[PDB]
């Protein structure tokens, strides 16, 4: 329930590691990268003059 600006996301990965373990954290990291790429492409964010 935040904006997740690269400081919340590393914190959430850290908490996942410290609470759940190693392998769930690996699965979570892979899924995070997949969904981040997918929704960045869906977002269509671009720079203009």
């Amino acid at each position: 329930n935040q904006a997740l600006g690269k400081k919340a996301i590393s914190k959430m990965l850290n908490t996942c590691y410290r609470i759940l373990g190693l392998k769930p954290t690996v699965i979570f990291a892979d899924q995070i990268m997949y969904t981040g790429f997918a929704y960045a492409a869906r977002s269509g964010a671009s720079v203009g003059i």
Binding site: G21, L22, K23, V26
Partner: protein
């Protein structure tokens, strides 16, 4: 296939000793004279030995006792 070796690490906790134990088990299964104690999914001997350690049915002590048993048999 063992993507992560965490289970084997907690089974025998050193992260350095299981390499040696699994190397010994893989050598036994690969040179010859031994068969896997876990179902074979056409894996290499490496992850097979790692799975055997993870299941809790292979370690250093029982490897030594099996070697002693084989020596006593002959």
């Amino acid at each position: 296939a063992r993507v992560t070796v965490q289970d084997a690490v907690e089974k025998i906790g050193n992260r350095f000793d299981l390499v040696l134990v699994a190397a010994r088990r893989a050598r036994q299964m690969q040179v010859g004279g031994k068969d896997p104690l876990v179902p074979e999914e056409n894996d290499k001997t490496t992850v097979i030995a790692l799975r055997e350690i993870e299941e809790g049915l292979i370690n250093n002590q029982i490897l030594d006792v099996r070697e002693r048993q084989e020596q006593q048999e002959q």
